[PDB]
Structure formats: C-alpha cells, structure tokens
Write an enzyme that holds these catalytic residues in place. Structure first.
Site, PDB file in Angstrom:
ATOM      1  N   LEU A  11       3.448  48.956 -44.733  1.00 46.43           N
ATOM      2  CA  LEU A  11       2.179  49.304 -45.419  1.00 46.43           C
ATOM      3  C   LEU A  11       0.970  48.877 -44.617  1.00 46.43           C
ATOM      4  O   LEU A  11      -0.071  49.467 -44.751  1.00 46.43           O
ATOM      5  CB  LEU A  11       2.132  48.642 -46.805  1.00 46.43           C
ATOM      6  N   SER A  13      -0.525  45.854 -41.206  1.00 43.36           N
ATOM      7  CA  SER A  13      -0.330  44.630 -40.465  1.00 43.36           C
ATOM      8  C   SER A  13      -1.636  44.102 -39.848  1.00 43.36           C
ATOM      9  O   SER A  13      -2.610  44.832 -39.778  1.00 43.36           O
ATOM     10  CB  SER A  13       0.667  44.871 -39.339  1.00 43.36           C
ATOM     11  N   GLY A  14      -1.657  42.878 -39.318  1.00 42.18           N
ATOM     12  CA  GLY A  14      -2.927  42.383 -38.787  1.00 42.18           C
ATOM     13  C   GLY A  14      -2.809  40.992 -38.275  1.00 42.18           C
ATOM     14  O   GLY A  14      -1.699  40.589 -37.928  1.00 42.18           O
ATOM     15  N   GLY A  15      -3.924  40.233 -38.266  1.00 45.84           N
ATOM     16  CA  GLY A  15      -3.833  38.855 -37.774  1.00 45.84           C
ATOM     17  C   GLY A  15      -2.769  38.025 -38.539  1.00 45.84           C
ATOM     18  O   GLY A  15      -2.094  37.160 -37.960  1.00 45.84           O
ATOM     19  N   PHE A  16      -2.617  38.294 -39.844  1.00 45.81           N
ATOM     20  CA  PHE A  16      -1.786  37.456 -40.665  1.00 45.81           C
ATOM     21  C   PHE A  16      -0.283  37.658 -40.400  1.00 45.81           C
ATOM     22  O   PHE A  16       0.473  36.705 -40.610  1.00 45.81           O
ATOM     23  CB  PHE A  16      -2.016  37.770 -42.128  1.00 45.81           C
ATOM     24  N   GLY A  17       0.127  38.910 -40.038  1.00 44.23           N
ATOM     25  CA  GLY A  17       1.592  39.346 -39.983  1.00 44.23           C
ATOM     26  C   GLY A  17       1.650  40.827 -40.444  1.00 44.23           C
ATOM     27  O   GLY A  17       0.729  41.603 -40.107  1.00 44.23           O
ATOM     28  N   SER A  18       2.636  41.182 -41.272  1.00 42.10           N
ATOM     29  CA  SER A  18       2.927  42.597 -41.678  1.00 42.10           C
ATOM     30  C   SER A  18       3.443  42.690 -43.068  1.00 42.10           C
ATOM     31  O   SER A  18       4.147  41.776 -43.508  1.00 42.10           O
ATOM     32  CB  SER A  18       4.085  43.162 -40.735  1.00 42.10           C
ATOM     33  N   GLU A  88       4.555  41.585 -56.320  1.00 40.30           N
ATOM     34  CA  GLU A  88       4.420  42.717 -57.207  1.00 40.30           C
ATOM     35  C   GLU A  88       3.891  43.903 -56.446  1.00 40.30           C
ATOM     36  O   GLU A  88       3.023  43.761 -55.597  1.00 40.30           O
ATOM     37  CB  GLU A  88       3.337  42.237 -58.203  1.00 40.30           C
ATOM     38  N   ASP A 134     -11.786  35.651 -49.264  1.00 37.19           N
ATOM     39  CA  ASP A 134     -11.878  36.934 -48.523  1.00 37.19           C
ATOM     40  C   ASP A 134     -11.987  38.104 -49.494  1.00 37.19           C
ATOM     41  O   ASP A 134     -11.272  39.104 -49.420  1.00 37.19           O
ATOM     42  CB  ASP A 134     -10.623  37.046 -47.618  1.00 37.19           C
TER      43      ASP A 134
HETATM   44  C1  LIG Z   1      -7.269  41.319 -45.356  1.00 40.73           C
HETATM   45  N1  LIG Z   1      -5.874  41.422 -45.901  1.00 40.73           N
HETATM   46  C2  LIG Z   1      -4.866  40.789 -44.998  1.00 40.73           C
HETATM   47  C3  LIG Z   1      -3.446  41.110 -45.589  1.00 40.73           C
HETATM   48  N2  LIG Z   1      -3.336  42.540 -45.896  1.00 40.73           N
HETATM   49  C4  LIG Z   1      -1.967  42.896 -46.310  1.00 40.73           C
HETATM   50  C5  LIG Z   1      -1.507  42.588 -47.700  1.00 40.73           C
HETATM   51  N3  LIG Z   1      -1.024  43.528 -48.446  1.00 40.73           N
HETATM   52  C6  LIG Z   1      -0.512  43.262 -49.689  1.00 40.73           C
HETATM   53  C7  LIG Z   1      -0.504  41.952 -50.120  1.00 40.73           C
HETATM   54  O1  LIG Z   1      -0.056  41.955 -51.359  1.00 40.73           O
HETATM   55  C8  LIG Z   1       0.350  43.179 -51.758  1.00 40.73           C
HETATM   56  C9  LIG Z   1       0.907  43.505 -52.973  1.00 40.73           C
HETATM   57  C10 LIG Z   1       1.203  44.862 -53.100  1.00 40.73           C
HETATM   58  C11 LIG Z   1       0.886  45.726 -52.010  1.00 40.73           C
HETATM   59 BR1  LIG Z   1       1.256  47.570 -52.326  1.00 40.73          BR
HETATM   60  C12 LIG Z   1       0.330  45.391 -50.797  1.00 40.73           C
HETATM   61  C13 LIG Z   1       0.032  44.039 -50.708  1.00 40.73           C
HETATM   62  C14 LIG Z   1      -1.062  40.927 -49.330  1.00 40.73           C
HETATM   63  O2  LIG Z   1      -1.141  39.741 -49.685  1.00 40.73           O
HETATM   64  N4  LIG Z   1      -1.453  41.291 -48.082  1.00 40.73           N
HETATM   65  C15 LIG Z   1      -4.372  43.113 -46.829  1.00 40.73           C
HETATM   66  C16 LIG Z   1      -5.722  42.894 -46.112  1.00 40.73           C
END
Ligand SMILES: CN1CCN(Cc2nc3c(oc4ccc(Br)cc43)c(=O)[nH]2)CC1
Length: 273
Positions: A11, A13-18, A88, A134
């Site tokens: 879905l 990815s970025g600085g944090f991971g994927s 979730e 954030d």
């Molecule tokens: C600035 N942030 C960094 C992490 N990034 C990824 C992320 N996605 C999800 C995260 O929780 C989710 C729950 C459901 C679904 Br669908 C997608 C996510 C999340 O913590 N990070 C979102 C942008």
C-alpha cells in the site's frame, strides 16, 4: 508467526518502512501489515510488563479502544531488523491526501464534517496521554462506506507532556514557526497549528506554506473562495504566537464548526456510500 496472514499488495512505503494489505487467515478480517525498520525508529519505549518496543506501539496501545476515530493495533511481532504491526483496515478506504488529489478543494460542509471528526480523534489521543505530532492528510483514512475518518501512524508521536519538546521528526510544512525558529514547541499548540494547515488544505486543496520563510511569516492567502468564518478559524489556528491559538474546545465552539453532519449523512451526501 505470519502464517496467520495472507499478504496482499504493497500500500505504501517511506522513511518508516512499508505497509501491505493483508487478510487475517482465521477469520478473513481485512488488516494492514506495517513493517517498521529498527534503524529508522526515532523513539523507543517499553511495555507495561516492560519489553523494548517502538514508541509507536506504546502509543497505539494507549489509544486502543472501540472508538473508531483512531486506528486499532490488532497485534504485533518482533524480527531481527524490524517490527511488524497488524492494524485494522477499513474497506473500501482512501487516505485523505488521495481524496483531495482526486477531488480538489472540498466543499465546506464536507470539510466541516471531516475536520470535526479529526478533532474528536486528536482529543481522544490527548485524553489517552498521546501526542500524534504528524497530523496531515496522508495520516487520515476515510472509511468510505461509513463516512468515518481514522487517524493512523503514530510513528512520529510521543507521550503528551506539559513541558517543551525539543525533538521533532514529523512533517516540516505542518510544523509551527516556533519549531522552525527555535527548535522548541509545546504539544497542544503545535497540534493546533497543524490542524490549521490541515483545514486550509481541505478547503483550498493544497497546504498554505512550502518554505520556512512562509511558515515564520505566517501570512495566509486564500487561493479558493472560502467563507469568512472558515478563514477566521484557519487564521486563528495559525496564530504566530502559540498562546494566541485556540484550544480544542475553542475550535469546536467556533461558529464555523456548528451543525456538523453525522458520518453516515456525510457518506450519503458526499461519498455516495
Ligand atoms: C506519513 N505516514 C507514514 C506511514 N504511512 C503508512 C501507513 N499506512 C497505514 C498505517 O496504518 C494503516 C491502517 C490501514 C491502512 Br489501509 C493503511 C495504514 C500506518 O500506520 N502507516 C502513512 C503516511
């Protein structure tokens, strides 16, 4: 182990991971599977028992409840270079950044409904002793069927405190002038600055400041037609002096905030759901 989950498409990815779409094998529950790389973890914490985990896991546990406005942590695993968070996943869902990319500036009634819901989600985080740090469109998911927003991503967050923060690793163009100038801010008034950049973004279809100089000058120009009550609230949230910004209560009592739609009504009118 993750034989409990079928992994689906990446879905983001970025600085944090994927993060991946996934499905919990036992009941078919939709989930998201977030991989957090250790070396990128800006803060660690530890559990009531006292295991060494990302702060993000501590914060998610503090805010876990049946309140649907903040994402629920379902489970988590440790690995040699990463953690894996199971979250979730609403379905169908779209983050607010993509929603705005696709739809442009939001009608005020829709912005009011979304902004109100975000304020209820942030107040819950603060009541649970968590500062998100954030808040921004890409960290907000829309449960399209139900018209319900969810705040995600506590990867830049911290425990809420009444004294000054001197560290920050959330998004620079949402961070307040006292961070840019002095590298110091207090939790709630920095939260409220970011809420002002978010409400601008919703009603104008883009954020108001790109450069540090624009942040520090704090002069807001409306590039779309927006009502004077909305403009008044945005410019209040973006008061240069922290103690000049509204509290949550003052934002939710603002004339612009009155008569908000219910989420289902929001889905029916605006999301065709
Ligand atoms: C600035 N942030 C960094 C992490 N990034 C990824 C992320 N996605 C999800 C995260 O929780 C989710 C729950 C459901 C679904 Br669908 C997608 C996510 C999340 O913590 N990070 C979102 C942008």
């Amino acid at each position: 182990l993750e034989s409990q989950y079928q992994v689906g498409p990446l879905l983001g990815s970025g600085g944090f991971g994927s993060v991946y779409s996934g499905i919990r094998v036992s009941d078919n529950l939709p989930v998201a599977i977030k991989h957090v790389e250790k070396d990128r973890i800006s803060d660690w914490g530890e559990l009531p028992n006292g295991t060494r985990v990302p702060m993000e896991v501590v914060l998610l546990k503090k805010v876990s409840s049946g309140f649907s406005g903040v994402i629920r942590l379902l489970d988590w695993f440790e690995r040699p270079d990463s953690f894996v968070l199971i979250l979730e996943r609403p379905e169908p869902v779209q983050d607010l950044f993509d929603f705005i990319t696709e739809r442009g500036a939001l009608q005020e009634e829709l912005a009011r409904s979304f902004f109100w819901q975000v304020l209820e989600a942030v107040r819950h985080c603060h009541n649970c002793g968590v500062l998100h740090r954030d808040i921004k469109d890409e960290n907000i998911l829309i449960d399209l069927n139900r018209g319900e927003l969810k705040l995600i991503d506590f990867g830049s967050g911290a425990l809420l405190k009444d004294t000054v923060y001197t560290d920050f690793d959330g998004t620079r163009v949402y961070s307040p002038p006292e961070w840019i100038r002095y590298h110091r801010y207090h939790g709630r008034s920095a939260a409220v600055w970011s809420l002002g950049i978010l409400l601008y973004d919703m009603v104008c279809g883009d954020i108001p400041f790109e450069h540090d100089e624009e942040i520090i000058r704090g002069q807001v120009f409306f590039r779309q037609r927006v009502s004077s009550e909305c403009q008044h609230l945005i410019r209040w949230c973006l008061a240069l002096r922290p103690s000049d910004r509204p509290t949550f209560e003052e934002i939710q009592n603002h004339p612009w905030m009155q008569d908000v739609l219910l989420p289902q009504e929001t889905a029916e009118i605006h999301l065709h759901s």
